[PDB]
A and B are shown apart, each in its own frame.
Chain A
Amino acid sequence: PFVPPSWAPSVFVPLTGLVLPAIAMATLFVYIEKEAP
């Protein structure tokens, strides 16, 4: 059927908008400032 639940946007929109970008920005920020050995 592939139909997502009714609560799917209420969970995926906040995820993709705040949780995933925060994790991506934190990991990318740590990677950019990492010093080479």
Chain B
Amino acid sequence: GMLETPVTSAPIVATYLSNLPAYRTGVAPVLRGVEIGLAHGFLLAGPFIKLGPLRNVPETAEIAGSLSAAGLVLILALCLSIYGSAQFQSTVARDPLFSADGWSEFAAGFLVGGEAGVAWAYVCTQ
């Protein structure tokens, strides 16, 4: 039926994907959101810091970059919240993340983790 290849059938990549927080299937959604948010905010703080309009002025490039990354994390959190509200409206085991309450807790955890990751990336450059 479907096409099987070593890229999608290797046990190493399957274990790597299963080790990711999104494919844990059994932990609290807020913890998953916190982990994903931290991992995303830490990498997100970089481009705004090194390439923004205030990248050449000293003592404020990191400030502006971190604030921009924080705003982006806030926008992504709002996107996650509206996605959860418009996706789960009615109706192994079923993952609790794919539910209204689960996705709302996931979005809140993502917001907290993203802001913490941005703040940690800002102090890591000092």
Q: A: which residues have CB within 8 A of B?
A: 22, 26, 29-30, 33-35
Contacts and interface: CB of A to CB of B under 8 A. Distances in A.
Interface in B73-110: 75, 78, 82, 85-87, 89-90
B78 A35 contact: no
Contact of B89 (A22, A26, A29, A35): A35
A30 B82 contact: yes
Given A22-B75, A22-B78, 13 more contacts: A26-B78, A26-B82, A29-B82, A29-B86, A30-B82, A30-B85, A30-B86, A33-B86, A33-B87, A34-B86, A34-B89, A35-B89, A35-B90
A35 B90 CA distance: 8
Query: Size class of B's contact patch?
Result: under 10
Contacts of B89: 34-35
A26 B78 CA distance: 8
Nearest to B71: A18
Contacts of B90: 35
A37 B93 CA distance: 27
User: Which 4 A-B pairs have CB atoms at the shortest separation, nearest pair first?
Assistant: A33-B86, A26-B82, A35-B89, A30-B85
A22 B82 CA distance: 11
A34 B88 CA distance: 10
A35 to B, nearest CB: 5
Contacts of B86: 29-30, 33-34
Contacts of B75: 22
Nearest to A27: B82
